[PDB]
Subunit: 336 residues, 5 copies
Amino acid sequence: NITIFTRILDGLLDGYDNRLRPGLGERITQVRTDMYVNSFGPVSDTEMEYTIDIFFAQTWKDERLRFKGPMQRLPLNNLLASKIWTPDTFFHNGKKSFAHWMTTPNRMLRIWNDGRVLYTLRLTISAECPMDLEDFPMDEQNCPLKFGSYAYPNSEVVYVWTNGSTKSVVVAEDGSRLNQYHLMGQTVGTENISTSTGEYTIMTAHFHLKRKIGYFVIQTYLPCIMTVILSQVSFWLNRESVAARTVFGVTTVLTMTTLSISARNSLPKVAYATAMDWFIAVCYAFVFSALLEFAFVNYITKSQPARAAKIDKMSRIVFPILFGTFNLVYWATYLN
Amino acid sequence: NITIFTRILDGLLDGYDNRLRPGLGERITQVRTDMYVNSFGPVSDTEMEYTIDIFFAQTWKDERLRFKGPMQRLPLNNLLASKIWTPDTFFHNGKKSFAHWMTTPNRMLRIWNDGRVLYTLRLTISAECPMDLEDFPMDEQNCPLKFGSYAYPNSEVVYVWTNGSTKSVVVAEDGSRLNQYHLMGQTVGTENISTSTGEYTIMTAHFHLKRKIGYFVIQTYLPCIMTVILSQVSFWLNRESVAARTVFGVTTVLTMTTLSISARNSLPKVAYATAMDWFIAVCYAFVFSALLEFAFVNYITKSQPARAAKIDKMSRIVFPILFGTFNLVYWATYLN
Amino acid sequence: NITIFTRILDGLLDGYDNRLRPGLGERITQVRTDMYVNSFGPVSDTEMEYTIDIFFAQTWKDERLRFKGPMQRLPLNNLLASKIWTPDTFFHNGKKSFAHWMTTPNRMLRIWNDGRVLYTLRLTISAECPMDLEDFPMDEQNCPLKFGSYAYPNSEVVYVWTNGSTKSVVVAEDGSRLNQYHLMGQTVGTENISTSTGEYTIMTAHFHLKRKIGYFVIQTYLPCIMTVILSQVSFWLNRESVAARTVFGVTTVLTMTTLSISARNSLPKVAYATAMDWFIAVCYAFVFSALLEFAFVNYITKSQPARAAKIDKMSRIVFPILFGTFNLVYWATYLN
Amino acid sequence: NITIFTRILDGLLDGYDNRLRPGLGERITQVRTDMYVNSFGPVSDTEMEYTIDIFFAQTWKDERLRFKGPMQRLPLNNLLASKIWTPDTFFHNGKKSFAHWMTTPNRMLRIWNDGRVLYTLRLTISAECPMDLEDFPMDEQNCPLKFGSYAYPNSEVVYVWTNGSTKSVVVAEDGSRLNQYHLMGQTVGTENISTSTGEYTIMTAHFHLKRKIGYFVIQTYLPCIMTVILSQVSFWLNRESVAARTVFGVTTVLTMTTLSISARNSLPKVAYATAMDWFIAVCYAFVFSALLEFAFVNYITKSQPARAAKIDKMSRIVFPILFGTFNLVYWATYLN
Amino acid sequence: NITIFTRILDGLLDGYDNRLRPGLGERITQVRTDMYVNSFGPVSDTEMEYTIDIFFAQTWKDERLRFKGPMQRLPLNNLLASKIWTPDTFFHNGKKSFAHWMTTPNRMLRIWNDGRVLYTLRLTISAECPMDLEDFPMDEQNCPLKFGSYAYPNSEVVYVWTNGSTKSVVVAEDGSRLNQYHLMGQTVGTENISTSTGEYTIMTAHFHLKRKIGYFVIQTYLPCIMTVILSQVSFWLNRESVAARTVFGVTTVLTMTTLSISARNSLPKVAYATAMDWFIAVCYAFVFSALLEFAFVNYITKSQPARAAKIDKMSRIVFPILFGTFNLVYWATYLN
Ligand SMILES: FC(F)c1ncn2c1Cn1ncnc1-c1cc(Br)ccc1-2
Ligand SMILES: FC(F)c1ncn2c1Cn1ncnc1-c1cc(Br)ccc1-2
Ligand SMILES: FC(F)c1ncn2c1Cn1ncnc1-c1cc(Br)ccc1-2
Ligand SMILES: FC(F)c1ncn2c1Cn1ncnc1-c1cc(Br)ccc1-2
Ligand SMILES: FC(F)c1ncn2c1Cn1ncnc1-c1cc(Br)ccc1-2
Ligand SMILES: *[C@@H]1O[C@H](CO)[C@@H](O)[C@H](O)[C@H]1NC(C)=O
Ligand SMILES: *[C@@H]1O[C@H](CO)[C@@H](O)[C@H](O)[C@H]1NC(C)=O
Ligand SMILES: *[C@@H]1O[C@H](CO)[C@@H](O)[C@H](O)[C@H]1NC(C)=O
Ligand SMILES: *[C@@H]1O[C@H](CO)[C@@H](O)[C@H](O)[C@H]1NC(C)=O
Ligand SMILES: *[C@@H]1O[C@H](CO)[C@@H](O)[C@H](O)[C@H]1NC(C)=O
């Protein structure tokens, strides 16, 4: 009772032209698409790209595949996929996507007696995410995903999300395993682009990414915060100890500088100032300013000692407060 | 006496449809799988992936291949593999797996007169291992491996480990050659997932990894441990030696900071604090606190010298004990 | 009403030799080309290459494809592309270009009843950009793109930009997403090369790149500028403070040196001096010269103290002015 | 007189089944193998792998290819290689091997009238070398190479080195161009493995690698050796010079630490101590101990100056001798 | 008038055996080769390899392709290339070469009525260049390129440069765009190798590379040269300034050491001393020796002050001269 399926299958491929879309010159082909994100790959900030794995699925109606038999469905594999017509779907925003040919080309094809078809596939896409690091690291990146027909304009093939925009895109609970980002939600949209080769429908999906702070705090902020405190210890030393206070300010300033250099190594070479850079600059001012106060004090301690002591004692209560006050404004502004 | 085999082989492929699973619409195909891990590839903590090489094997019953002849077995190669039906097995947790086509596509196919089949294959899989580095480096990672049918639901194709769960998975003695991990054992499990395309059976194998400490001790802990001791030498110096004690504390603190920066370079950019980070912070407190004691002592040595000497002498017996006491609690807690 | 298209398509491929160009031995084939840059990939200064993605398009007239039917156009896909003749276009300046085979080979083929053809394609090209970093970072790189026939000389196949040189090349608004470069415009040109295998027409497109400064200012210039100021603080200290002033000059000089080493790490290993290098050298002279002044002052303070004070006080008003004056000339010269 | 060869060639392929080994069910196929190492690729200690290029050659007897003609040999190329049966040879120890398809698939096939065959091939193998870095850098690594049949057990196909074990493996004089290793010789062995799929013969070749020291001496040992000497200069300074001697010991100790961190960067992350690590630790003790002596001396110079001078003067003659004595034992032990 | 070409083409392929070389068993096939280097890729000193792009061309006589028609030449493309016989040329010195399949496989095939053939091709070769860095950076590397037949010995196929050895190899003016090397010229040679599979002719081409100094001067020499001068400033300071002179020598020595470590990072891990290493060692001696002089002076200033001043004053005129004298000998020796 297996040879019956072979006879049914052969009839479908008899005279089936895979170079022609269904309903050619009779109507507009309608494609219903759903996606399941197996795992959201790492996001490369330097390259402005994010890898992703998805079980991309498509559905369309083809009368040429109509058949009648005891079985209402015909599970198949990639062997018959190339023997029929499939949409020339491509990712406009993608850069380099490679398929999975292990163990067998990962493609499932299902056909119903009514002629409805389902051609799912597994993909790995190194899409590009243009990020505006103006509020880095307190930023909410919106990395989009776009795909559509490469040869069939909007007047022939139309892509529409299936079962609404709610269950069209699904993300696995463990799939979202980013180290420096925290996925919040997904949105799906549609648009038309009027290129030189006619209008083309575009299916757009956006993933809302909220960067999870804590790595930079342990890596950049705390060394800078503790670096500033180290300089302020100099104000608790005798003025005549020129050598002692010199080491604090001099060593602290250089240590402040190298942190800025090291911090941007991981960060992309953006041609503007981020929020972290402003914080570093402010920390640089405190340590640098403390050195100026010591230099100024030593320049007048031999002429007006009375004012020299007042400034040094006052600095012990001014600089810590300003740095503390600045942090509250900085953190509150960017955490609200 | 070789042409007889050719005639037998030709009959099997005569009318054999490779697009249809055996026992279609008559029963549920049963697949028995066994694995042999030739070598457990390196584990990339940064990318949360682990390479592995396996001689993946599969077995199933197909009556269409029944034959009678003098030989009870028909060893073959990849040439005939594509001429018949094979399961569309795929690794759900895999990211990028490439086959070995050297010297010849590494595939062995064996057939018995009863119709039983054996289709073994050699694979290299860059699977993903989600790790929770909360107790790093004292962690017991459990990197799983998952695979199953891509097109045939649980109602048609079922995967089961052969000869129980003991000898189903085998690891070579020299295959486990990890540098920073020590494999302890393996476990195999089965589960069903109810996706939008029906239920699918999943074969899950977990490898218990116990990180072997000793690289971080020579790389991070000892420099930190010796860094703390260097600061404590300052307490064995005259109070008036402001410049001498300043270099110890100031240089030590910065050296402590850079170790934290360098240590996390190899570690993944995790947005939380690991056990090692807490140890570094404690070491930072000792060196930083010693500097505060020196600064405080110098602030009062001109007013109450009597108490200044007591604190300095006391510090020689307090700080070493606290650091030593902390280590025992830290090591004992994370080594138990 | 679909079988009619199949009959029309079959007639075109009946006796169509894809090894022979249209109009062989009768005229010269004319090819009209247009380009759309989906995204200008990153520019690797170290490797002198720039990635780019384009929807390269070609057009030519072929009488062998003439047909008459109800439909004036025949949208198709890659399936029929290999069945006909296409130009052997190649990128002379390219190094490694790979096509996009996801989801389906991204190729659109359109045919009109008149015989006109359109064979568009999506490409990713790692072209090479020879850059002259004499005025780095104030440079205007002109990265060209070249392509032409590999087998058909200028006497048989000619490439010409379509619809003039204005709309021939189009760049997406969001496609130009470079981090350290700011695209200004594009130019297209044509030329002939007389190789040993006859004359070949070459289509050349140049992209005008204006480097966007701001990353190096925050990375190299400012640390150098602030490094110089740190040394000048020494002039505001007592002459007898040999140890204090020694740390400033000595530490500053070494910090100046390492910045030069670190700065060139990202920069390509060019065997000549860039504008930034000259700026670093000048900054090195100021810090180094300040150390010499301190050494010279200490060498005479025991013999002629009167002149020692004058030089130290004078230096407080000379070095800052010269460094400030130099910057205006340096920035004005390279920003004009 | 060329058409005669075509007729002879056609007869051989007439009825030749490439899915069946020669002498099936009549005897055991015997394969003679010889190798020529064109170049021993770089050895990646971090990845425990070594690239290699070889003109792997195989020989076997096939009566189905017997022919009679004027020419006793039939040089051919890869075109006919796929039309006949070839062994399913694979490298058990290999990880990722890719063939050379430039300019043409590099395969030479030769056939004699007697039926003897020769199927040579060019390969690039990224084999894995498990190294025991217990005596690093004074180690003699033995990187093996293993290959055998993937589908044919020992009872059907047997691999044997040709013309003995002397000329079976040949290495080019200029092929061995390793930077940090010095090849000494090669050994070839055979063994049987009783897997779950029957016995399989294995051809094993071992390359004796003797690491050539001199890079680490200029990179690690000498900086450590000179670093120790720098500290010992402190003993030639006045005791009251607390600041001067402090810089020597303090700066030296930190410089000693960073060398250990930098040294292991190139070295694999091995979870144990190497010989170099012990040498570094000993050097650390000398510099660290010298600091303790200075601290201890300053702690008693105000109470018992007489003994303070004796220790300082004695240290000038003790520490240099112990460090010198240690080196002779260390170098002699690991160089014998 | 196009169908005539098709008929002529069909006749050539009628009975044309592509597995047999022309003139089999009648004469020795002669192949004339010419090369055009489009661009000399980067030279990786670490991997001892150099990328290169070439329009490799071959020519040979085949009587089987003789034809008579109005056109004396038959331009073609890769479509017909696989239908005929081509030499099995391979690069003996190559490691990994990949062809260019964009937009179409870059292959031009031309045939004349006389039977002469021309099969040009575009290649990218990652050849290996064994370099002897004994005089680094003043070295004249000679990177060779070798190729020949893989299956046809010298008795059947012979490779000879066309039109002499002058115009056989051509390099584009802009193709030579190396950053740290300056190409001077090219040489072409021929040789025979008597392997186990008969004699094989080898075509060898050598490219004379003259390293262009200037990157290392700005990167290594100048920091070392200026580092030495910094130490010599100490001799212009009062002897009793123990702390001041200590910082110069101590800081300078460590800075000298790190430059050696950093310099060799780019350089390959060669197990011997280069010219630059000797220069660094000499610079190390000057800075290290200056420290010894200061230590020795301070050891006797309390016993024989008269000689202490003489040595310090003398050192101001000795060390600068010796370092200056050494440079002239060093530069003159390696620049002649
Ligand atoms: F005219 C050619 F450049 C061309 N070749 C393919 N396309 C185009 C037009 N074009 N311009 C930008 N993006 C496109 C586009 C978008 C979709 Br969706 C499908 C096909 C194309
Ligand atoms: F519905 C589509 F998205 C789809 N295409 C393939 N699959 C699915 C369902 N799906 N969702 C997550 N994982 C799967 C899955 C699991 C196995 Br095992 C086999 C096939 C699929
Ligand atoms: F004579 C051979 F070396 C050769 N083989 C292909 N070409 C050449 C001539 N050549 N030299 C440099 N660049 C070329 C060139 C340019 C175009 Br456009 C198309 C083909 C070629
Ligand atoms: F039983 C399966 F796992 C299996 N599939 C292929 N092989 C095996 C047995 N096996 N286990 C480890 N190594 C092997 C081996 C060795 C040679 Br040589 C040839 C084939 C195999
Ligand atoms: F005998 C086998 F090892 C073998 N297989 C291919 N070759 C050889 C001989 N061999 N040894 C080193 N280099 C070669 C060589 C050189 C040329 Br040119 C062409 C073919 C070969
Ligand atoms: C795109 O085109 C379709 C068909 O004309 C239309 O229904 C839809 O509204 C268009 N979408 C937009 C955003 O204009
Ligand atoms: C999976 O499905 C099979 C068949 O229904 C069943 O026997 C098995 O118990 C199921 N497994 C689980 C974990 O539910
Ligand atoms: C290239 O050749 C064509 C045809 O001869 C000619 O029309 C054109 O002017 C030439 N271009 C140049 C730059 O010489
Ligand atoms: C391997 O098997 C063969 C055939 O039985 C035998 O001759 C040979 O001695 C065996 N080798 C070893 C090492 O046992
Ligand atoms: C190589 O062999 C050919 C043919 O025998 C001969 O003419 C030529 O001189 C040989 N070359 C060398 C270098 O011996």
